[PDB]
Design a protein around this ligand. Structure first.
Ligand SMILES: O=c1ccn([C@@H]2O[C@H](COP(=O)(O)O)[C@@H](O)[C@H]2O)c(=O)[nH]1
Ligand SMILES: O=c1ccn([C@@H]2O[C@H](COP(=O)(O)O)[C@@H](O)[C@H]2O)c(=O)[nH]1
Ligand SMILES: O=c1ccn([C@@H]2O[C@H](COP(=O)(O)O)[C@@H](O)[C@H]2O)c(=O)[nH]1
Ligand SMILES: [Zn+2]
Ligand SMILES: [Zn+2]
Length: 431
């Protein structure tokens, strides 16, 4: 048994790993590259799609399923396994990616072909392929997210997929992995742990009361898939002590995801499920409003506070959020609250440097509004959690992370007596 990295080698996007064992070929994830690596979605996979026996998707995010339609576009016609939740979220993600994408590397017929071969596989359910046995484990990173357990030829491999941040409340705790001959694991935060969750919420709430009590606007850049709904959840469970104000989920996509959430109840933590049992949707805080079009979105820029605004892109790459910043950063009564990692050299970082001004949408805008970064809202396991999850595993191959972050984790794992390396693109690793 061998595992071949075909994405996320010393980088965080493009996750795709070819599992070779028993004359069978199983692709573990098929994500697109993003940001500065976007063009690479137009390049070859590195393997022959037509020879793939099956595909397992760990979660619906674009950097894990974005190239799936390219796979079908190039011949593949085998099954694609994933949890019901992922299958459902995928439709929303892929349909949107198709529409909202400068240079497309796939057409609408490919998305249809992809969606049509999706087959549900829940946690604890074993898929048989030749002498190979596969199963999903709880990853706690997204509704329906998982890590993969592959056992065959008398050996065991575990592909972590993306591990969640267990301190948070919306998703169930990641399950520990079984003891394995090899663990292919992410190390996004291989270099550090996150600020504790609870104190992150307290701080989040203090910022809201302060800003809303004075009539200002709280701008929150957010990813549409799960981060936005999580903020909504915090607003729900604490709205009782926050000043009344409209909550604008200024993201059609996030709205569609939110709508799907009631059908995914079993994929949330016990806490969330219990809320649903009492007949209530904890992702709909009072005052919630979904802004569907540009006109209402822009109008918000001119309307006075108090108000809470959630918009994308989550990394200020573009989107409606840029317009809210352009018109709201110059007011000291407002507040910009990051709840998701900001890339180095991006607009976020620039703002965090707290310079006199910033250039947004071709204009120099004064930065008077307060700024806050709440890394505790992160959706990935922090360094400490990564070490706990990896505890006792003899061999670890790291993926999904910047080289240095990955090295930082490897060093600690090595000092712990665990064999580790940083996966290299196209280079098979024996299990
Ligand atoms: O594009 C879609 C959306 C939903 N469903 C199906 O509609 C039913 C209800 O969805 P859900 O309750 O499982 O979320 C399920 O049997 C599901 O497979 C589809 O086949 N295709
Ligand atoms: O040091 C980091 C931390 C996170 N991320 C990326 O940014 C996203 C946001 O992660 P988070 O805000 O949930 O922590 C992740 O999906 C990942 O691709 C990085 O590139 N480097
Ligand atoms: O170190 C390796 C080992 C296998 N493969 C890939 O595995 C498939 C063939 O497997 P096999 O004939 O080595 O068993 C090919 O698509 C090839 O790209 C690699 O890329 N690198
Ligand atoms: Zn992810
Ligand atoms: Zn990822």
């Amino acid at each position: 048994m061998r595992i071949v990295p075909f994405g996320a080698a010393r980088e965080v996007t493009g996750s795709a790993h070819l599992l070779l064992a028993g004359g069978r070929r199983v692709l573990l994830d098929c994500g697109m590259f993003q940001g500065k690596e976007e063009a690479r979605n137009h390049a070859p996979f590195g393997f022959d799609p037509k020879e793939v026996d099956a595909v397992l998707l760990t979660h619906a995010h674009l950097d894990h399923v974005g190239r799936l339609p390219k796979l079908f576009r190039e011949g593949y016609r085998g099954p694609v396994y994933a949890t019901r939740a992922t299958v459902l979220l995928m439709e929303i993600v892929l349909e949107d990616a198709l529409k909202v994408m400068d240079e497309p590397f796939f057409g609408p017929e490919d998305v249809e072909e992809a969606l049509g071969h999706l087959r549900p596989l829940e946690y604890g359910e074993w898929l048989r392929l030749g002498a190979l046995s596969l199963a999903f484990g709880q990853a706690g990173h997204l509704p329906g997210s998982a890590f993969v357990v592959a056992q065959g030829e008398g050996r065991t491999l575990v592909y972590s997929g993306d591990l969640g941040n267990r301190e948070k409340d919306v998703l169930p705790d990641p399950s520990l992995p079984p003891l394995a001959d090899l663990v292919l694991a992410e190390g996004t935060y291989g270099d550090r742990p996150h600020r504790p969750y609870r104190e992150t919420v307290r701080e989040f709430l203090e910022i809201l009361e302060k800003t809303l009590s004075q009539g200002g606007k709280v701008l929150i850049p957010t990813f549409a898939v799960e981060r936005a709904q999580e903020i909504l959840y915090v607003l729900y469970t604490h709205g009782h002590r926050l000043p009344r104000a409209p909550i604008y989920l200024d993201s059609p996509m996030a709205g569609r995801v939110l709508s799907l959430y009631p059908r995914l109840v079993r994929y949330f933590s016990e806490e969330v499920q219990a809320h649903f049992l009492q007949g209530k949707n904890p992702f709909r805080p009072a005052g919630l409003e979904v802004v569907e079009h540009t006109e209402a979105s822009k109008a918000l820029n001119r309307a006075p506070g108090p108000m809470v605004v959630l918009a994308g892109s989550g990394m200020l790459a573009g989107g409606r959020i840029l317009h809210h910043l352009k018109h709201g950063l110059s007011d000291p009564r407002n507040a910009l609250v990051f709840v998701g990692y900001q890339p180095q050299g991006g607009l976020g970082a620039e703002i965090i440097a707290r310079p006199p001004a910033v250039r947004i949408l071709g204009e120099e805008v004064p930065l008077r509004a307060s700024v806050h970064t709440l890394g505790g809202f992160s959706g990935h396991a922090g360094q400490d959690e990564l070490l706990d999850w990896l505890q006792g595993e003899p061999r670890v191959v790291l993926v999904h992370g910047e080289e240095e972050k990955l090295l930082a984790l490897g060093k600690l794992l090595a000092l712990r007596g665990q064999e580790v390396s940083l996966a290299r693109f196209g280079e098979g690793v024996p299990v």
